[PDB]
Design a protein around this ligand. Sequence first.
Ligand code: HEC
Ligand code: HEC
Ligand code: HEC
Ligand code: HEC
Ligand SMILES: [Ca+2]
Ligand SMILES: [Ca+2]
Ligand code: NA
Ligand code: NA
Ligand code: NA
Ligand code: NA
Lengths: 131, 124, 355, 354, 376, 376
Amino acid sequence: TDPRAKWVPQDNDIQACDYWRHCSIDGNICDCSGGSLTNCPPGTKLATASWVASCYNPTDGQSYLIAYRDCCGYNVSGRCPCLNTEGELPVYRPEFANDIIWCFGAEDDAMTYHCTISPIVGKASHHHHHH
Amino acid sequence: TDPRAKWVPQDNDIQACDYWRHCSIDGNICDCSGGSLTNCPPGTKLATASWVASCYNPTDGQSYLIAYRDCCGYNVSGRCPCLNTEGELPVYRPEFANDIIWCFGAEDDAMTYHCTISPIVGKA
Amino acid sequence: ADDALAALGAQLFVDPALSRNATQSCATCHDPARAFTDPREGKAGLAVSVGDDGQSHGDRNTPTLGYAALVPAFHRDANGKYKGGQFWDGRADDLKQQAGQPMLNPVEMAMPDRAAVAARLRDDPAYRTGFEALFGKGVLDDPERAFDAAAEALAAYQATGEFSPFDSKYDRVMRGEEKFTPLEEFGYTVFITFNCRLCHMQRKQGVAERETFTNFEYHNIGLPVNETAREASGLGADHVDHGLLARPGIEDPAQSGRFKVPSLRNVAVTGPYMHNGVFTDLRTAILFYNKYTSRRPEAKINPETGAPWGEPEVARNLSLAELQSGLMLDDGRVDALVAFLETLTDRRYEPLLEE
Amino acid sequence: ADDALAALGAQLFVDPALSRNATQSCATCHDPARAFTDPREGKAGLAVSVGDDGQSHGDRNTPTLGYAALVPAFHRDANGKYKGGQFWDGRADDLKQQAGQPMLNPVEMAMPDRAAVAARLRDDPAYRTGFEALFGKGVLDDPERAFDAAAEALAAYQATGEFSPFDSKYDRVMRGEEKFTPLEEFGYTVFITFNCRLCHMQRKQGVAERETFTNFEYHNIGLPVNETAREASGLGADHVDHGLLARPGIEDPAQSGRFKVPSLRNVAVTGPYMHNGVFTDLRTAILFYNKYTSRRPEAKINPETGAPWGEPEVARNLSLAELQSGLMLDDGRVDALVAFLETLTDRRYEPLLE
Amino acid sequence: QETQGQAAARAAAADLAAGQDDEPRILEAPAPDARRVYVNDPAHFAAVTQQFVIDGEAGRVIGMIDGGFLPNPVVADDGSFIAHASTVFSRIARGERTDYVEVFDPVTLLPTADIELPDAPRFLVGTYPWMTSLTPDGKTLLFYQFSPAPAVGVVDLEGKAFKRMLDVPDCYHIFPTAPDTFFMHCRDGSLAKVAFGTEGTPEITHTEVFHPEDEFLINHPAYSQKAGRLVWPTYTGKIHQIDLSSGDAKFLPAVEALTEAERADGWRPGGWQQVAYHRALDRIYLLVDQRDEWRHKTASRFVVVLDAKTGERLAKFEMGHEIDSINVSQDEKPLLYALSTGDKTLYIHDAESGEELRSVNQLGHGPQVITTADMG
Amino acid sequence: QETQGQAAARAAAADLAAGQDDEPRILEAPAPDARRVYVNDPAHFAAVTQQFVIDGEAGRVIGMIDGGFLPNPVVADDGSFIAHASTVFSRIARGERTDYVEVFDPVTLLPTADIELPDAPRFLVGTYPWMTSLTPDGKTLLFYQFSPAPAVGVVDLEGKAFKRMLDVPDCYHIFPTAPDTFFMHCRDGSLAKVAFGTEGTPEITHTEVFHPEDEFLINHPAYSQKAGRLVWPTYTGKIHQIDLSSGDAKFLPAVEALTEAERADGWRPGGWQQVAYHRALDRIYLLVDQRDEWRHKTASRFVVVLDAKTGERLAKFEMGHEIDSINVSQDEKPLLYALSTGDKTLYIHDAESGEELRSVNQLGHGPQVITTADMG
Ligand code: HEC
Ligand code: HEC
Ligand code: HEC
Ligand code: HEC
Ligand SMILES: [Ca+2]
Ligand SMILES: [Ca+2]
Ligand code: NA
Ligand code: NA
Ligand code: NA
Ligand code: NA
């Protein structure tokens, strides 16, 4: 809760903003509006675009690439809001930028932001952000 | 601040929920989004319909008829929300009912609730 | 002196010597037994009145004189609304300016000119004493002064408590002397929450000291021509009564068809209604406003005729912002409004309510 | 024994006695110096290969054998997507079932029948020894057992580490043994954030142990006919390659025009690209995906011809949900993708990158 | 009493250690069941609004549905669909208004119908559940209109079409009893029975007057369609009960939810959905607290439970929060749902003991209405 | 010290006592002036949002404007109009998308233009002011598009019509310099000048690269169009200044908003609108605090004020609240506006002394962007 302090990941509670996979999430955690860690809630549309972060998992000491995806087509959930920005770069490095509504590719051209999922896609880190 | 205590009017600050004319207000006080006690904010539309309450004025000991009017056509202001229900009767006595969106008559058929004004219209 | 001027007006008011054939006084058409309106039947029923010639009908309904003395002199307010004045089109600035006009109007009292009114005043020793005492020796020998004095007297008489007694049930209830019935109370609450109060209350907000249930403004509420009255008046099938635009010096076409909001005091006993006496029953006058709010077919049908209300005499400048309120008056609320408007009757006319 | 089986497959793989006129072996078309693809220029360039008769050309491009051993046997998954198998249309279930097919294919090695294959095997004293040691005495006298055994050996050989060494720059970087350059890391980031990872990664999520940059699924990405290859193939201007629908037992019309997602390992050195070899340059292969996303007129044009890409050979079943991603690849991201895909080249082929 | 988020982290960590793959996708809500509860958030008259679908057993949001300005939610008792009557505008809260009904599949939450209501005919009012109502067969939605006069609109959900407006007397609310019949409450203190057809003036019969002009009947009566039971508190916690199960109104004896001593000491009901009724147990629940007589929409902290037949008090629960609305699940061992508008939290209680079991917070801006299905 | 609501009570009581009548009506906002300030609430990505128009001198809300999903506001510097580019959907957050520009009269707040933008071309992103920009003459609005690629749309406000999209390089933000010219910042670290006065593809020229690949320029640079000054901090508080006043980019000496010692002690800019620029004073204001390097979007409690010409620090203010965004009025004795997203409050400070003068609370759900006109 010091907002300016270095963020400290945990691996025990995915609805909390300090859960290790949420290291560059911006919005709301989908598990709090009827989705789950890596699935969208009923009625929303899963975007195909993504943003990446290398998130350190304190459990096994490894850094994993989390390719976030938005669940779109609904007004924002309002449950479990979180903004983290580990390795987050400005908009002109959009692969690592998180203010962008990443709803591209969602079915029915859905473009409104409801919540974000945090699936792992790889094990790697970045020049600009490595453990 | 005890929400269940008898409402206690004051005649010293119109932006507060216990201001005497707001005895049956439901919504938001217009003076807090660019209107005034008896005028709507710019860009909103003044309804012609009204609901009435008899509100005691602690300044002069008199009860006055306040014929509330909604300012309509904008999303709810979100500022100075208030809900009082002195004398407020259920919907089947609509002249004294305050959950109804009383936007009837407003220009451009505006029907969304923004805020409410509290003009006097008579002695009660 | 304030008393003496009014007492002179009292005599002139009932004096048929101020009409050409000496058949008609102000009291003929403004009958004190009928809230100062005209009980006499003419070719258009009670819609319009017959002049001293026994043949000429006017084109507008004779209004009460009760509470006319509360109306401001004619003026334009800053928000650009004309208000106040006398006659349904506000063409007289005030009561004094209005008073001479029936005397000289050939369709009413039909005196040829001021000198002729002065000659009738001189013939009466009581007028020579009463006028000379208030206005000076010789007043009756100067037609302009004699006529202006007569108008002053009449205007003073109509400013007396006799014409504006404030002794209706409404007034009594507001003094805490008695209470409305649930039906009268409902009626009052309807009147103040529906659109009626937007025009038939003195003020926009606050509390009026001597409420007369008019804001003295001018509105076109879109009434049709009263055909039988229009035929009786002789003004012709192509005539348009432009209301306030007929006042000399008003040129603004937006004023066409607007008439002065009447006080609703005594309305229950002063039928028929509106500027041309078009509706006989008070309920019908109230039902008229449902044509702007109700979507039912009956809303558009005049219950007195079984036919549509009719095209407005003046289609333009209607007060639609006020009239198209989005809520109609169901029969319970019309009943309540009737009940409430009957409480605006002066105590001495309460006996007329039964009939 | 596993070693012996694969070693017998190593012998078969380069043996032209498995072709009718003894002019060609597996290795002729899957040349180990070219990541097991075909370097020979025929009538349609390198798009299609010539068979043992020196004239017949196929209609599809010869794919690498590297990493083909990682592909699951053909099956339909629980979401009703078909996965796995061998050939561009998955018509073989696995490497054993596929190995026999070029041997008997008249447009490829052209042996008339299994008996003719068994006879050529019996002619070689080393094969009598090697096959008998593994499959028993007289295996070569029975054409069915001989041909099945030859297929088993070849499939065993292709499952050795030599075909799937996992020694590319990408493998080294994932082992933490070196780092991508900035351009290669940008390229990897583009690959995993744009639509490519929807089809060219083994798993939906988690970490793959032996990634080969394909999910083994079948997709119609809407490629045009390769006119010169289709001419060379002799299949007729009237022919339509229906992809997976051509697999016997597949009847579902939604599979028409879908082909197996290829592994992108060694992609930089196995041009030309796609099932018909239609694009010679890796950059053109990447740019083709911009046809579904960019609104620039240039996105409609094949840069190798200067003319429109051409209508899809099969109009229907296009993977539009995946392809119409709403984001185009500008030239910087194309450069980054090329750089990334170059890191998927096996160490022994790095000198081909040039 | 590992939390939902904790269990999920444990399971995700175990899938990661196991190398388990799963496809990111759109989830289906679990099958509707007796413990599903919906909470609607009118959001203090905001132009757009939210409904939260919740599993009351787990205390978990299982989905959401967006709505427009003061929409009216309905839930089919049999679990087959949910719907709402909603209003939107071409430029957020200005411009052209469109009123519409949407019907949603209760598992995928996708709209399966979107039915325009001509001439913007909905009554915009702080949300009263019985201002829009399903007939018992689920085939018709009935909604109230106030302007220009009281009327009821008829929407055919099976045909996905607006049918007609019925003109009614000066009456309010809509309690359907049959495919073609519903009751309303009239200003004169009667109920009106309205029986309607595709065309033609409906047959409107009034019942006897059943309350005086100075007893005020709340805007949120409870109505059990399957029981035909209309449970109607007044401001003093006197409860009228009307049995419509015969198809006509039968007036049952009145009960008092509060004792004479409690009323003398200031106890009155108060909140928004102040009353609930459990059909199988025939039990009435009422939000009450000590309050001044005109603080009838404030939250209350207590719920009294009474036998609907005898009026006998069965319990008085201390809720431990500022509760505005209550409702119950309609199964055995029901849940008592206690929604706090100020805390934006639904508290989920054992209805027999009163104990708070679990709670679901962050339910929008000003959540007020709880709806359940009576599936039994 | 009498508050606005107190003074309003006394005036109302005086009107009553005196019998003064007034007509209830729709107020006009006071004429735009240097101390009017606009606060936009993107409301944490909600589908509908609000803008608050405030008199900074009285600390009073003088009006509001409703918007759709992540709208971009613009304010004409001469006070003649305000406008936004906004996005709505036919069923709250689902269905057909419509993007549009509205222009509003700044006293009546009435829309004087509503211009549809074909094919839903806006970039939907947490609000960056210079992602939609007016040309200096006020006749053209330029907005950014990200999908399918960076592009800039040209809207004719005089003709009230969308004109065309301009294809650009891999670049971001729009800083207009003339009626037909604007600059953007490229991924490669150059700025691009885009000249579009002629029809067809614009003339696009790049500067030299002005920052390295590992120096990160924030999403909220300050741009004074009347000065032609682009003030662009990096994550460490190094400030790039580009002078666009000749129509071409000239790079001014870089300045450091923080000392080497403060940076070694953890000081970094952070928040949303981190930087403001006062044109007449040629003065730079930067929100800073001690933070980990990747907490760059969190609130800060300090503002440093520095001379743009020399880089000399003029002041460092403890703001006394968690501030996300700052801006300044462009008059003499300017106000320093300090908005807290978490408190939903705009704190209004004397820019000279840093002292807090007044505040305006309840500004929506998550307010983040402050805009002022430069009327001098
Ligand atoms: C022949 C019938 C008749 C006689 C006699 C008559 N009036 Fe009238 N009175 C009318 C009519 C008709 C109107 C409305 C005319 C119009 O609006 O043009 C009127 C209107 C007035 C009004 C304006 C009231 C209002 O609300 O606008 C006053 C005052 C008035 N009369 C006073 C007098 C006085 C004083 C006399 C005697 C000197 C008099 N009247 C004689 C028929 C008459
Ligand atoms: C927009 C202004 C306006 C509104 C609103 C309005 N009126 Fe009127 N009313 C008038 C005017 C003007 C007249 C005279 C019309 C004419 O005769 O040309 C009038 C006349 C009447 C009359 C006839 C009086 C007479 O002496 O002839 C009655 C009765 C009446 N109004 C009752 C009502 C009631 C009750 C309501 C509310 C249902 C109402 N009015 C609403 C303007 C208004
Ligand atoms: C004349 C050239 C040629 C020869 C010789 C040849 N191949 Fe192929 N190979 C191909 C072509 C072309 C394809 C793809 C054909 C298709 O998909 O229909 C192919 C496909 C395969 C595949 C499928 C790989 C994939 O990703 O789908 C395998 C395995 C294979 N070859 C192994 C062999 C073996 C083992 C031999 C020797 C018995 C062999 N090939 C001989 C040209 C040849
Ligand atoms: C919808 C699934 C899908 C997507 C998304 C996809 N591909 Fe492919 N890709 C394929 C299939 C299937 C083929 C073989 C197509 C064929 O030949 O019919 C292929 C072929 C290729 C080839 C030629 C490989 C070879 O050996 O011939 C390359 C290079 C390629 N893809 C790279 C990309 C890149 C880079 C992306 C992202 C820009 C991408 N793909 C997106 C399915 C996909
Ligand atoms: Ca009359
Ligand atoms: Ca190839
Ligand atoms: Na007539
Ligand atoms: Na005139
Ligand atoms: Na070719
Ligand atoms: Na087949």
